[PDB]
Amino acid sequence: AMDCTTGPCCRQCKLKPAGTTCWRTSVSSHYCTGRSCECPSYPG
Numbered sequence: 001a002m003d004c005t006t007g008p009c010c011r012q013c014k015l016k017p018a019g020t021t022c023w024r025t026s027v028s029s030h031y032c033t034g035r036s037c038e039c040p041s042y043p044g
Contacts, residue, residue, distance in 0.1 A: 007037035019044075 004013035009022045009032045016022075018034025031044040 005037045009039060010037045 004010070005015050006013075009016040009020050011017070015034065015037060016032055018032055020032040020034075021030070022032055022039035023030040030039060030042065033040055
């Protein structure tokens, strides 16, 4: 509607749906909670 929420976990101009990975490294692997564009600091 208004807040497009730009960033890594964002659907172009909206909040990316929960489940979208945004923190997977050699010793990391998390997912999005479809609540915010920023990746959470906890595993799925």
